[model samples]
Target: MSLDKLLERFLNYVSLDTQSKAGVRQVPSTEGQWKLLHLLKEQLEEMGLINVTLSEKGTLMATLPANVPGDIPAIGFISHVDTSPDCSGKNVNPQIVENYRGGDIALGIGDEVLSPVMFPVLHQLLGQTLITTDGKTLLGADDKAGIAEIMTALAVLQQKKIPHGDIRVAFTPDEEVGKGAKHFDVDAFDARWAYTVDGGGVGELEFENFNAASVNIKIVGNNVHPGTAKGVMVNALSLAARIHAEVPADESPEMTEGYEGFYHLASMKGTVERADMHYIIRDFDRKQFEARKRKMMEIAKKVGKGLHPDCYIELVIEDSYYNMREKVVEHPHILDIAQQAMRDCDIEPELKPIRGGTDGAQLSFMGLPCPNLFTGGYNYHGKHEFVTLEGMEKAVQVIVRIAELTAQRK
Candidate 1:
């Protein structure tokens, strides 16, 4: 595919506002996802893909049949349309720095500068085209770039007549909100395996992610008037604070990295009568993840009981998602093919563990055996985010090669 065409596709994708909203009960947390999904439905059919269907929950699945014949197992490429809720994805005015001569490039909106000083990754792309945000809103390149690359690869497959087996493509919503695969029709998708092109940076491949759980702690306290509060009042908020103090400081998010587990305090609320604490627990290892939950219960028990007899602490830990490594490891060919495809594109595959979960992690347990591939962008969910044109082009080649290599297999 032409570089200009790839760039155009990417630019057009980022132009749409698809930010996933918080606290939504629906699968597609925002309507912008619906817009993108409908647009993709049109684009896929226009590209001559068959069986294009958009589910009620906003999952768009399409098929590009085998050009070479034979019963090659169908494989898929997936990306989400939802941008993160962390920043505004409205009216994303992007800047195209053609042939970057290094140093800092001004984002042209605020005092914000896409600096090499802060992001040393820019040094690697010394003389390449980079697309950045206008510093007013997020660029949405995170998975939009992923969507663009997959679309470009589909275009390439059709136009270039790359001999390949059945290629399935899907665009999902609310991936940023952790429910991209929640309503996905795995049976309808009907692929042997799939890859979510949503990883960070270039040449990145991930089969493992954190084994995650959410912890909710509620403390009940007796409240009385301040004048009569000496012996009658028990402060629930104080008890909540004590629990926070009891949890080890060293095991917090800021203090941990690289296969390390941590207890993150997500939110807290209440008055002296009652207090609610929300926490998210994470670990790459399942045993550690369970142990972390147990540790929280122990801390809550000790803190509550040791305090006023009237005070009660209730703890609930719900499992969110698990590591995809177990599922992906079952099919080594999936990983092997991806790495080989990267090599074929002159890109070295950099295998890394995702610190957080992807839709792939959840899909793996759903019997899809999906893993994550890089989208050629870094610094997602914020203003400093960017994707190199060369990086995205390489991702397109990797996708095409993966299709070719998969078709060649038995």
Candidate 2:
């Protein structure tokens, strides 16, 4: 398949605004994303695929049966359709810088250029065409690139009548909010192994990710007149700020790298009589993951005493998912096959542990043993995010190659 065709498909996906929101009660968290999902379903059906179906949860799945007569173990490729709601995804004006110069690139209508000094990844993409959002919004390259790449590859295989086994293609929702695989129907999809096309940078092939959880804390205080405010008044806002200050400054996403875990205070808001704090606890090590949560609760208890004998406190914690390594390690063949595919495409695959989580992590535990592959996108979920057309095309080829390689293995 021509690279232009692949690039064209990716550019098309970027044109749609599918950013998902955090802390929402709805399944998609945004109804606007479903419009893009329906568009994808229509496009896939028009391409002459089989078993094309969409769930109430807004997930889309389709199949391409084996051309060979004998049964061949199937493989799947997965990516999410929603973009990160960190920035606006509406009215995305994409500019294609063909044969890019090694320098800064402007985005949005405001002409906010992302430079190499700020985004070193731009230097690596020199002389390669990159598709970026106008300065006002994120590029949505996080996984929309994954959607375009997979769809293009499937069309390529079908057009050429490539010899292959049963192949399943899926587009999931809520990956940005970290619930990508929450409603994934593993048994119904029926693939022996799968790969999530949702890694960050080029060469990123991950099988492990951090165990994550969200914590919401509320504090109540007693308000008293200024004249009698000696020890009778409890300042809730003051106590909330103190709790955040007590957390180690070194323990943050900016300070920590590789396997080092951190307690990051994401957001906090409060008044004199009431306050609320939101903290996200993450760690690749399961033991430390629990320890971090425990440490926070301990502090809350200590602060509770100082505020009042009965200072109202509430803590709600939910375990998101475990390290997918527990599942992927048992099925090393899946990793080997993906790694080998990268090598064939003249790209070195970096098998590093994901500092954050991916849909693959949860799906692995759900009995799929899925790993993740990069989308050649950098600075995801931010204003300076960009994706190289040349690299995105290579990603499409990698998906095609993995499909054929798995068929041969069977």
Candidate 3:
């Protein structure tokens, strides 16, 4: 695949503001997502790809038909059309660091710098061309780089007449807000298995993700004047704080790593009359995940009982997604083919668990058994993010090789 074309595509994609919005009930959750999906639809159709479809909910799917003789199962690659809602992704100004010479690089925002000290991964990308933002907004390389790599790979496959089986590719929206696979039609995708080129850092190959759930706790308390409030008033704000305190301090995002579960207090707000608190519970093990939710229920009951008879507590917990490992492990060849493909591209595969959920996790449960690959990016969803050109090029090679190897499978 052409490295220059990949860079061109990535820059153009990032230039468009495709940031997704949360708490919105719509499939895409934002208009920017639809804009990008339409752009991608036209790009694929112009490339002469077959069966390009852009759904009403902003999911785009296309097929690159097999050029080989015998019957081989179709494989697919996927990336999100939207960036994260955690930061501003509008008018992203990217700075190019040609021949990155080992140290910290200025991001052109006052004295802010994208340093090697904070992110040691920079040490590995010596003498490479790196792309960083101007520090005004997120780089959006998290999945835009993935989209570029996939598009470049398809172009190369078509031009070089690469002998392979059918390759399916899709771009889904609202991935950053976790509804990426909501409208994805598995039967219509028509692939034996799929890979989401949406992870960060080079060589990252992920199959496991957190079993996720979110809890909402609401407490109502009586508020009276201080002069007439001797056990006559129950503070809802205090109850909210108490519930959060009851959760173990050691079990939190800052304290946990690598398969360790955590109870994260995501948001909280309160008044004496009413208060609300939200928490996200995550674990790799299903049993532990259930236990964490149970623990929250117990905590809520204990705190609510001590309140005034007139007061009340309302608790709600909803599951977001599950770990993909259970479904992916059933198909061992998926990992085997991906790992071999990375090695063939001279990349040492870094097998790891995703700290957060991806669209692939939901797609796997939807009967696709999809895993995640890297986009050679760092510090995703925030300012000070960067990606290397060489990493993007190698990822294109890995995608190309995976198609070739899958065709030759015995």
Candidate 4:
């Protein structure tokens, strides 16, 4: 397929807003993602695949029949259809600058510069076509590019009638909100193992991510008239502020990277009588992950007791996923297959660690041993996100090569 065709598929994906809503009791987390799921299923089946299936909760899977036909383990390529809710993923306007100028590239009507100064990725694609989003929303390159790349690769493989193993392809929803893998049918799709094309950068190959969890802190206080409440009222918002102040300044997302753990407050909203704080705790080290969560609860209790003798402070913590390193470590051949595939495409595979959690990390712990691969994207989940036509074409090559390599593994 030409670079233009691959880009056309990606453009179609970005125009659909599939951002997930967090804290929803619903299965897929948001209904908007299903719209994209339906479209993908129709498109995939129309391209002449088999066993196309859409689950109740917006998980779409299809099988590409094995033409090589030997005893080979089934393998899958996975990507999430949902975009990040952090920005407007709907109504995307994609622009391409051919043979990039090696400097700041202005995007959208506002002329928001996807600057080389801050990103430095511009230098990497000096002479390649760079696809960027309008300033108002993220590019959705995070996983939409992954979805399109996978489907395009599959289409090419089918068109060429290439011999390969039983290839399972899947599109998941709600990964950004932490509920993507929750309903994934590793058994139903029946892939021996899978890879999520969701990581950032062109050559990123990762099997490890932070042990993750969510922490919610609620504070309840007695409210009284401010004019007469000199010493009689215990203000909840003030207490919340005090606890926030007490949180170590260095223990934050901006302060650390590359395995160092941190307590990042995701969102906070409250009033004088009541306050609630939501946080995501991340650590590569298992022990430290527990310790961080424990320490925060200790602080909440101490501050609550100190602020008022009878104040109420409640902390709820939930474990999200564990580091997939220990899991993927046992299956070195999987990494070897993907690494060899990247090399086969003349793309250097940058084996790296995921600084944050991905759906693959969670799926790995769920007995699938899933890993992550590059989607040929840089600076994902934001307005600065972009992918080159060349990079995505490479991604398509990598996916096909991996399938071919998997067929020959046994």
The model with the greatest TM-score is 1
Off by over 4 Å in 2: 22-26, 29-31, 69-71, 108-110, 218-222, 237-242, 271-275, 301-309, 312-316
Per-residue lDDT tens digits of candidate 3, residues 85-204? 888889999999999998999998577799989888888889999999988889999889999999998988889888889999999998888788989999999999999999878899
> Candidate 4's error at 198, in angstroms?
1.1
Please give, for residues 1-410, the per-residue lDDT of candidate 1 as tens digits: 79988888788888999999878998798888898999899999999999999999989999998889787889999999989899998899999999998889898756989998999999988888899988888888888999999999998988998889999999998988888989989899999999999987788999999998999998999889978899788888999999999898899999998889899998999999999999999999999998998899889888877566667999988998899898999988999999999998888889899888889888999989999989889898899999898889888999999999998894
Supply the TM-score for candidate 3.
0.94
- Give the distance in Å from residue 253's predicted Cα in candidate 2 to where it truly belongs: 2.6
Root-mean-square deviation of each candidate, in angstroms?
A: 1.6, 2.7, 2.0, 2.9
Q: lDDT of each prediction vs. the true structure? A: 0.90, 0.83, 0.91, 0.85
Instruction: Give one digit per residue, the lDDT tens place, for model 2 in 33-151.
Output: 78888988999889877899998888889888786766778889999989887788887777888899987776655658878998777777789988887788888888888888888
Q: Please provide TM-scores, in order, for all candidate models, with all chains considered together.
A: 0.96, 0.89, 0.94, 0.88
**Candidate 1, 390: how far from true, in Å?**
0.5
Q: By the lDDT metric, which is better: model 1 or model 4?
A: 1
**Ten-residue segment with the worst summed lDDT in candidate 4?**
302-311
Give per-residue CA lDDT, model 4, range 32-150, as digits (tens): 78888999999988987899999988899999888786888888899998888888887888888899979887887775878988987787787888888878778888888899899
Model 1 clashing residue pairs (backbone): none
Worst 10 residues of 2 by lDDT: 302-311
Best by lDDT: 3
Candidates 1 and 2, the one with greater lDDT: 1
